Structure formats: structure tokens, C-alpha cells
């Protein structure tokens, strides 16, 4: 996260760290959506241009974390993956269209002060909240700059940007399964996700029922926090039929 601040303890209890078993390292962000399901970006698991194609056994999920590198004994829970499910129409060849994946845990994680699931939006919550100017929150342990690493989980609040402005900021084809967020050069405020934050959640606090909803998944950006550029997020509600289908089966 670029130009963010340290998260408060238990501020993002749905935050999940995707962790490589060997070599032991941060792979991506992710989120807890139930006691046995974790949501992330498909590119965190499958990205052929980088020879990335993980199996369940290559990964671990670390829940309830605050410190990036330390083993948070009696606070974090480390979980094994039973199965990975990637959107069948995930477009890794062009623009990361449908950049979404689900990971089923081998055993349910126990909820605590530091571990709690985020809600997924229904049609009405998405219609109400997904509006240009409305701000969401992005969290992660990724790079603090495009070109170090944080000691603890980082947080940044960012405004949703108008679809024409998102399209006009890039040469990449932007789909209806994406939205972009961040400040314009003229707004005098900064902030963005960066390498290592991908797969992480973009959340909004509904003013109707005071619950936190995951509206987006950190997907991609042309660098990090560059003037005139924006962060691109997977539109969670647009892919809910697939999410529901996966969780209904298996």
C-alpha cells in the first residue's frame, strides 16, 4: 500500500495473507468470507506469463495477522487449502478480466477479536455504494512504493472513479467486471495498492446497516500511485453468480 497508514488492531479482521510454503514468503492478499472460504484474485494463483500455477499444497493462508513478518502466536491462525477454484472465464492473456478465485480451507477457522468474515454485497448494496466519489478501503502488506516493505498491515481510503476517467487513463480494455479507484492529480491526496496487495479486499461500510462489504478485489495497476493512473479492482457483485455456484457445490 502506497501513502497509507498502519492499521489499528482488529481494523480488518477479514484480512488474509496468502503465504508460499517454500521459500517462505508473502504471495498476495485475500479475504475471509466464512469460516471455511477465502476470496482472492485469480492471478495470485494462476499467471502463465510469470510461470505462476500454484497447487493447494504449495500454499498456506494466514488469518488474524497484523505484523507482516512475525509469527503472531495465539493471535494468527495458519490454514491449509482443501481446494482452489478459479473463474473459468478469467482472462490472464489480456486484461485480468474476471480476476477472482475461491480457496476452501481444510478445516474451519475459529472466529476471534482478530478473525471475522466480511460481507459480500447483494444487488441493492452494490447499486447504493458503487458510485463515483464514494470511498472504499484497501488493506495489505504489499510494497510501500513502486520502486520498502511495511512492518504492519497498511490501510488506505480511496474514491471510486467515473468509468470514462478509468478508461481514459489507460490503453488496456476495461470491462464491466472491473472498477477503478484512486485520486486524480488535481485532488491533492494520494494512495494506491502495490505489488503484494493484489488479491486483497476493497471494502465499504454500508451507512444503511453499518456492516462492512467487500465490493472489490485488488487486481492491477500500471505501476503504483502514479499520477493520472488508477487502481483496478474486480467487481465482486458482478461475479456473485459464480461465487454462489462454487459455494453451493463442493
Amino acid at each position: 500500500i502506497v501513502e497509507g497508514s498502519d492499521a489499528e488492531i482488529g481494523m480488518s479482521p477479514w484480512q488474509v495473507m496468502l503465504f508460499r510454503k517454500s521459500p517462505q514468503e508473502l504471495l498476495c492478499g485475500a479475504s475471509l468470507i466464512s469460516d471455511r472460504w477465502v476470496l482472492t484474485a485469480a492471478h495470485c494463483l494462476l499467471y502463465p506469463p510469470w510461470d505462476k500455477n500454484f497447487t493447494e499444497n504449495d500454499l498456506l493462508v494466514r488469518i488474524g495477522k497484523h505484523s507482516r513478518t512475525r509469527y503472531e502466536r495465539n493471535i494468527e491462525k495458519i490454514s491449509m487449502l482443501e481446494k482452489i477454484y478459479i473463474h473459468p472465464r478469467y482472462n490472464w492473456r489480456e486484461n485480468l478480466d474476471r480476476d477472482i478465485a475461491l480457496m476452501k480451507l481444510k478445516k474451519p477457522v475459529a472466529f476471534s477479536d482478530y478473525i471475522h468474515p466480511v460481507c459480500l454485497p447483494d444487488r441493492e448494496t452494490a447499486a447504493s455504494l458503487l458510485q463515483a466519489g464514494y470511498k472504499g478501503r484497501v488493506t495489505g502488506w504489499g510494497n510501500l512504493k513502486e520502486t520498502g516493505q511495511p512492518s504492519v498491515l497498511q490501510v488506505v481510503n480511496l474514491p471510486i472513479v467515473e468509468r470514462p476517467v478509468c478508461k481514459d487513463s489507460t490503453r488496456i480494455r476495461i470491462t464491466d467486471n472491473m472498477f477503478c479507484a484512486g485520486y486524480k492529480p488535481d485532488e491533492g491526496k494520494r494512495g494506491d495498492a502495490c505489488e503484494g496487495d493484489s488479491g486483497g479486499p476493497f471494502v465499504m461500510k454500508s451507512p444503511f446497516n453499518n456492516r462492512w462489504y467487500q465490493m472489490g478485489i485488488v487486481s492491477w495497476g500500471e505501476g503504483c500511485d502514479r499520477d493520472g493512473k488508477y487502481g483496478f479492482y474486480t467487481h465482486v457483485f458482478r461475479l456473485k453468480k459464480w461465487i454462489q455456484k462454487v459455494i453451493d457445490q463442493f
Binding site: E8, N157, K205, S206
Partner: peptide, 27 residues
């Protein structure tokens, strides 16, 4: 049923340091 309600915040009626910025953006 209990999704998106944080034990250290909403459950205790405590607010985090920047959630008001989000609410103020919801016109």
C-alpha cells in the same frame, strides 16, 4: 448473519480512525 461487524469496533460501538471519511463520501 454476523458478517462485516468487527469485534473490536462495531460490536463495542467503537469507531476506527478513518471510517468517518468513508461515511462523509456517501452522499
Amino acid at each position: 448473519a454476523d458478517c462485516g461487524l468487527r469485534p473490536l469496533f462495531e460490536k463495542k460501538s467503537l469507531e476506527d480512525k478513518t471510517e468517518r471519511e468513508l461515511l462523509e463520501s456517501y452522499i
